[PDB]
């Protein structure tokens, strides 16, 4: 109950909302049925439209008009945006040539250049090029400022998750807004688009920019706009706020457009009906910039033009029905559409079994357009698991499709030709970024980057210290002329040991054998040299990775590879080797098929043992440095050391073998050599972060050997592929992956075929950033290069997506 009998006279778009039951006059009162009786009349005027006409010029101020063309309007802050053009001979901002903004050119009293976030719903990246002829204001921002070819959204590529990621820097799993609809079991409550629960603060985690600003004494424009307030009124209200007195004027402002998303849902991304919404957005941009130029702010403010996600072609007829797969379809609740999330209809049904639902949804139809996963088995790059609001069962839906429970759910709901939500590496989901202003560079293109990075930059732009977030602060310093943040490398926490030969073979009782007794100081001082790190500059190109937690580990050197061997996990944390373009693939000689050799540098009590593998009927083993890539028959003996061994399910050894035997060589041929770093990951609580030893849920039977949840590889070469990887003078090129260490290949529907028909498609789906691997290992890579740290941070955030060109 609001006593809605106060009045908005003098309070229109007041910046501190008032506490019940005083009625409200802020830009959100409509949305709480809480506006003063006179809000419309005083605050939402519309008389005479939005533009000055020649015969309104110098008019006498009439307070009823939506905007003014009177002589006093400039200093009242309330002219129509085209006032100076119509009435004072000025040009529109879009008609002026752009000129570099080397310094903020601001009115006296401005402590810092304001930021204006101009956000557009459903603005797909390819609109920047494909609609360029009808978006002249946007094209000018783009080409005069700083722009990326596209900006990657977060998964799922829905509205609320992505806008709240822009606000916080966080993955949805950490901010809490994990879809446009959710159920939280702890609250026993649901969050929905229509309705009131979504206003409760308990849904919204992390610290959004407007709160970060406020706490640090920067004032924020009440960000968000009741949907019926027209765009023109939003722009005029921003422009008015910008005329406030110095002590009351905000430094950060937001504008949001529901277009082009709204039309895209109806017409598809490239419907002929989409040209008009794109014109109308561009005209709103022009009204802002014209209005800024009137207030002499057009070379003062930083403007960000940003989208939340793209839009794909999706129609009712491309719907898969869980009723064509499940007999038990009424015992489940589906969150449906461009993703699926399944839970039990009822907590009291102990006959509900996730294992059987997953099995019934796995590879059941030739062209099945969705793939089921337990959330911990989703690709790690999605960072979509560590929230109680994310259901254990997930369906990743193919682009262009929907999933639904039963056909009645669709025809008793074709209405629509566009949707979004799919995998955030899909091209049609990509969105836009442009920054224009004194703090952004001039006419600069930057590489694609993820929207999780922007919160840090927006903090940099306002002089704020960002709250902890999932950006990598400094990775977007190349967007900025100044205000850059100067990050430093984390300190190494554990220093390694460098063990020499300390154990005699007979001290080991590991149940390992090798046909190796088959026995000249030409090649004896030589192998001594190799075990002391004579070849280390070949196989360790960017320095050793730094260990950023407390542990006990050893550096081991070999002719062909170098490893950091964990005495706690009994296996390498990392293994580093270089494969030149010229290198050759060999086979494991027959006599050496089951050979495992004790490492006389490493105690038996810190070694794996072959007997546990024998007794463990599910678990086999592989090697991190592959025997197939040995430089010589003699060096190959090093690859069978028990310290190079790691636990592998037979199903996973198919993947791993194909990667090591076939793909590494292919990459070296294509990239002119590659440096590889491989190793295990343990993420049993699926939080994206390295497990401690007390979090491991599975061991090789009868032993303390922990079973990895994943295996990673980082593959680095020269960006200039005319230079070989081991003699690169400039920028690097990386691709990486985090493969799930699974006891079956159910994920790959074509897995009974040869590895050449399915392993690469799996690896592509499990592409990763080096930063993702950092979080999962507590390692810090690329510590010694000739490159600036900022450029290295950029490299560590790169994702190789395998999509074609936008
Ligand atoms: C992406 O970036 C983010 C941001 O940096 C990273 O997330 C952080 O990771 C930290 C490590 O997991 C985590 O730190 C923990 O915080 C606990 C207290 O946190 C509360 O206060 C903060 C501060 O304001 C607040 O942000 C938190 O918010 C979470 O929960 C609220 C309420 O539910 C939500 O609104 C909000 O969305 C947010 O949810 C997300 O995080 C939680 C985890 O906190 C998840 O469970 C959710 O699913 C969701 O993902 C909190 O309100 C603190 O209590 C923890 O301390 C334990 O461990 C330390 C180790 O140092 C130890 O000293 C203590 O003993 C303690 O143990 C005791 O508790 C254990 C667990 O209850 C118990 O088992 C023991 O037996 C002990 O009793 C810890 O410090 C930090 O909160 C989050 N921050 C955010 C915003 O998520 C994220 O890791 C990055 N991701 C990647 C991939 O890099
Ligand atoms: C989430 C919110 C806190 C937020 C943060 C930030 C921005 C904008 C922000 O919110 C803009 C805004 O005013 N609205 C957000 C959108 C929702 C979704 N919707 C719908 O019901 C809706 C809209 C489109 C849809 N597509 N598919 N389902 C849909 C559902 C109406 C509703 C309109 C209001 C900036 C980017 C400026 C910075 C950070
Ligand atoms: Ca076995
Ligand atoms: Ca973990
Ligand atoms: Cl959703
Ligand atoms: Na399979
Ligand atoms: Zn939408």
UniProtKB/Swiss-Prot annotation:
Abundantly expressed in cerebrum and cerebellum. Localized in secretory epithelial cells in the brain and the eye including choroid plexus epithelial cells, ciliary epithelial cells, iris pigment epithelial cells, and retinal pigment cells. Secreted lysophospholipase D that hydrolyzes lysophospholipids to produce the signaling molecule lysophosphatidic acid (LPA) in extracellular fluids. Its major substrate is lysophosphatidylcholine. Can also act on sphingosylphosphorylcholine producing sphingosine-1-phosphate, a modulator of cell motility. Can hydrolyze, in vitro, bis-pNPP, to some extent pNP-TMP, and barely ATP. Involved in several motility-related processes such as angiogenesis and neurite outgrowth. Acts as an angiogenic factor by stimulating migration of smooth muscle cells and microtubule formation. Binds 2 Zn(2+) ions per subunit. The keyword Calcium applies. Ca(2+) binds at residues 683, 685, 687, 689, 691. The keyword Phosphoprotein does not apply. Its EC number is 3.1.4.39, 3.1.4.4. Disulfide bonds join 8-25, 12-43, 23-36, 29-35, 52-69, 57-87, 67-80, 73-79, 98-144, 106-300, 316-414, 363-749, 512-610, 514-595, 718-728. SUPFAM superfamilies: Alkaline phosphatase-like (SSF53649), His-Me finger endonucleases (SSF54060), Somatomedin B domain (SSF90188). Zn(2+) 1 binds at residues 121, 159, 308-309. It is an enzyme of class 3 (hydrolase). 1-hexadecanoyl-sn-glycero-3-phosphate binds at residues 159, 180, 261, 420. It comes from Rattus norvegicus. It is found in: Secreted. Residues 541-806 are annotated as: Nuclease-like domain. This is Autotaxin. It catalyses: a 1-O-alkyl-sn-glycero-3-phosphoethanolamine + H2O = a 1-O-alkyl-sn-glycero-3-phosphate + ethanolamine + H(+); a 1-acyl-sn-glycero-3-phosphoethanolamine + H2O = a 1-acyl-sn-glycero-3-phosphate + ethanolamine + H(+); 1-(9Z-octadecenoyl)-sn-glycero-3-phosphoethanolamine + H2O = 1-(9Z-octadecenoyl)-sn-glycero-3-phosphate + ethanolamine + H(+); a 1-O-alkyl-sn-glycero-3-phosphocholine + H2O = a 1-O-alkyl-sn-glycero-3-phosphate + choline + H(+). InterPro entries: Alkaline_phosphatase_core_sf, DNA/RNA_non-sp_Endonuclease_sf, Endo_G_ENPP1-like_dom, ENPP1-3/EXOG-like_nuc-like, His-Me_finger_sf, Phosphodiest/P_Trfase, SMB_chordata, Somatomedin_B-like_dom_sf. Glycans are attached at residues 3, 348, 360, 470, 750. Belongs to the nucleotide pyrophosphatase/phosphodiesterase family. Changing residue 261 to N: Abolishes lysophospholipase D activity. It comes from the Eukaryota. Residues 94-447 are annotated as: Phosphodiesterase. Gene3D superfamilies: 4.10.410.20, Alkaline Phosphatase, subunit A, Extracellular Endonuclease, subunit A. One of its GO terms (biological process) is positive regulation of lamellipodium morphogenesis. 1-(9Z-octadecenoyl)-sn-glycero-3-phosphate binds at residues 159, 180, 261, 420.
